[PDB]
Amino acid sequence: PYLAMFGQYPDDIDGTTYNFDRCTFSGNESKPLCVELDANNQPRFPEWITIPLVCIYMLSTNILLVNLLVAMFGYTVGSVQENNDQVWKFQRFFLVQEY
Amino acid sequence: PYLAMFGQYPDDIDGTTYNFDRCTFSGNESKPLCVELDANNQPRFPEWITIPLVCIYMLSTNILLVNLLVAMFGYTVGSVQENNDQVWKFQRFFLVQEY
Ligand SMILES: CC(C)CCC[C@@H](C)[C@H]1CC[C@H]2[C@@H]3CC=C4C[C@@H](OC(=O)CCC(=O)O)CC[C@]4(C)[C@H]3CC[C@]12C
Ligand SMILES: CC(C)CCC[C@@H](C)[C@H]1CC[C@H]2[C@@H]3CC=C4C[C@@H](OC(=O)CCC(=O)O)CC[C@]4(C)[C@H]3CC[C@]12C
Ligand SMILES: CC(C)CCC[C@@H](C)[C@H]1CC[C@H]2[C@@H]3CC=C4C[C@@H](OC(=O)CCC(=O)O)CC[C@]4(C)[C@H]3CC[C@]12C
Ligand SMILES: CC(C)CCC[C@@H](C)[C@H]1CC[C@H]2[C@@H]3CC=C4C[C@@H](OC(=O)CCC(=O)O)CC[C@]4(C)[C@H]3CC[C@]12C
Ligand SMILES: FC(F)(F)c1ccccc1-c1cc(C(F)(F)F)c2[nH]c(C3=NOC4(CCCCC4)C3)nc2c1
Ligand SMILES: FC(F)(F)c1ccccc1-c1cc(C(F)(F)F)c2[nH]c(C3=NOC4(CCCCC4)C3)nc2c1
């Protein structure tokens, strides 16, 4: 999910896209466990629950949240522009007196 | 089209890029139907109609719309900053009295 915000889309969520080469049935390996199967040896997850969930998650993370953060940063830089100059001037005394 | 905003570019829009392995001629399969062919067994779509359409769609979605949303969020956070404090203070009474 952390990578999902950087444009990476989960792969093991669609039966068609899912590939069994990556996964392993047992734990004696270094790749993720395979999806739970059925008596017919096919993926069992409904596939109409995961896709909308991922769509909503990606919409919330990639787009809305970053835009909100941009807005907050804009307001913050606008609000405290003048006080930052005074703070920098105050610290300039220490910076100059250091040498 | 929903995924198209997350940076994914459609593949079955260019004759060179289009691959027949994914598609299926008949419906007895779990992958999308193949593009309509011609008497010579080649893709039939003009290829000069789809590409500009996709370019315009991607330009509208990925870039313009999200930037507009960012602008709206910035204006909204700027406008209602003071009233939000009063609303939070009002709800603080209920939050404190809950316990
Ligand atoms: C505000 C909008 C733009 C955001 C959400 C729109 C779509 C991205 C979502 C909403 C409901 C979703 C659909 C809900 C159910 C299904 C059927 C699903 O196929 C199955 O259910 C078969 C299940 C099986 O084979 O076991 C494939 C995706 C689809 C069309 C989902 C794909 C994406 C849809 C259209
Ligand atoms: C069947 C599947 C594919 C779709 C449904 C699964 C989730 C997408 C549902 C389950 C619980 C739902 C959530 C229940 C509570 C909330 C909080 C709500 O926002 C708030 O917390 C503020 C409410 C307010 O302003 O008063 C927005 C929707 C959300 C995430 C709901 C949206 C959709 C959720 C996550
Ligand atoms: C404001 C600008 C920056 C946005 C649009 C610019 C280009 C991305 C678009 C505008 C018109 C498009 C062109 C319209 C027609 C064609 C020819 C097309 O090839 C064919 O028509 C052959 C058809 C066939 O083989 O059957 C390949 C793409 C190209 C150059 C299109 C590719 C992209 C172009 C240059
Ligand atoms: C031959 C192919 C490859 C290019 C042409 C196909 C589409 C790109 C054309 C067909 C109809 C056109 C649309 C007709 C109407 C509108 C609405 C217009 O914006 C408005 O609705 C507001 C108008 C106003 O401000 O008065 C912007 C262009 C658009 C999307 C036009 C732009 C280009 C469209 C989508
Ligand atoms: F910037 C932002 F915050 F996105 C946002 C900006 C502008 C307007 C609304 C929101 C918002 C707020 C909340 C809430 F206030 F409720 F937290 C949201 N919650 C969710 C989801 N909940 O669960 C999901 C993740 C876990 C899987 C199920 C889906 C996404 N999307 C929200 C969007
Ligand atoms: F933020 C935004 F809105 F993008 C936008 C922001 C700033 C200036 C203009 C726009 C805008 C407005 C409209 C309209 F107001 F007309 F709706 C647009 N329409 C379209 C397209 N129409 O159809 C397409 C999708 C379907 C396939 C054909 C191409 C894209 N791009 C627009 C850009």
Backbone angles phi, psi at B37, to 5 degrees: -105, 180
Backbone angles phi, psi at A24, to 5 degrees: -130, 140
Q: How far is ligand 4, taken at its centre, from the CA of residue B56, in Å? A: 10
Bridge partners (DSSP) listed for residue A24:
A33
CA dist., res. B54 & res. B95, Å (int) = 50
Tokens standing for A60? Answer: 């919330």
User: In chain B, after which residues is the C-to-N distance over 2.5 Å, breaking the chain?
Assistant: none
The residue type found at A14 is D
Side-chain-side CA neighbours of A16 within 13 Å: the count stands at 8
Tokens standing for A84? Answer: 């930052």
Query: Which of A48, A62, A64 is the pocket-test mutation for ligand 1 (most atoms within 8 Å of CB)?
Result: A48
Method: cryo-EM
CA dist., res. B59 & res. B43, Å (int) = 26
Q: How far is ligand 1, taken at its centre, from the CA of residue B86, in Å? A: 41
E strands in A16-84: none
Write out chain A residues lying below 8 Å of B3, CB-based. Answer: 9
CA dist., res. A20 & res. A3, Å (int) = 22
Question: In angstroms, how far apart are the furthest CA atoms of chain B?
Answer: 78
B8 CB-near residues (< 8 Å, 6+ apart): A9
DSSP string, B42-64: SB-S-SSSHHHHHHHHHIIIIII
This structure's resolution (Å) is 3.3
CA dist., res. B92 & res. B89, Å (int) = 5
Q: Which CA distances in Å does A33 have to A24, A27, A30, A89, B72?
A: 5, 7, 9, 58, 44
